[PDB]
Amino acid sequence: AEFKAGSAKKGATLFKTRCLQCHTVEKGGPHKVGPNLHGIFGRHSGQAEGYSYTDANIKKNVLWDENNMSEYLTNPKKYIPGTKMAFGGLKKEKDRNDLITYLKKATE
């Protein structure tokens, strides 16, 4: 919850190895198990058009920014209990800073 800009090149590799299994970043991109993440920053949770969220994700109603995204990705089910995101998180703050630096641009 204290994000500092990092390495987008590392962040992209992190996205492929840790996220791309369940997510896409491009505009008009397909949903997988998880939603497409285009426009995720500056948007309240649960609002990927065409995806069906849990009540936990919708009720959380979090306005995604770099800080709360970092806290979320540390341990998703702690931040949003009841969510179906079967993913334990990124514990290393440096990974989260890199990943989020990539996401902010990749979903822009």
| Residues tagged in the binding site annotation | 19, 22-23, 85
Distance CA 29, CA 96 (A): 23
For residue 107, the number of C-alpha atoms closer than 13 Å in the C-beta half-sphere is: 25
Q: Which of 79, 104, 75 is nearest to 91 (CA)?
A: 75
Residue 2 CB, shortest distance to ligand HEC, in Å, is 17
Question: Which residues form the interface with ligand HEC (CB under 6 A)?
Answer: 18-19, 21-23, 33-35, 40, 45-48, 53-54, 56-57, 73, 83-87, 99
Residue 7 CB, shortest distance to ligand HEC, in Å, is 15
Numbered residues of the known binding site for heme c: 19, 22-23, 85
